[PDB]
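Subject: complex prediction, re-run

Hi both,

The earlier run crashed halfway through, so I resubmitted it with identical inputs.
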Amino acid sequence: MVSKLSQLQTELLAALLESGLSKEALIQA
Amino acid sequence: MVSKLSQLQTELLAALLESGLSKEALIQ
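This time it finished cleanly. Structure:
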C-alpha cells in the first residue's frame, strides 16, 4: 500500500523532528 | 543567524510539502 515516495516522506519527516525541528514549525511550513 | 542545520531543515520542509505530503501529516 505504501509507495517508495511515501516511505521516503515518512523517513524524512521523522529525521526532521529528531534533528530538532519543532512540530509547530513543521506545521507552518 | 541561521545555521547550516536550520537551513537544511528549511530546505527539506520545502521539499516535503512540494512532494505532496499534507500539512496535517506533517504536524502529526
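DSSP finds two helices and no strands in chain B.

- K.
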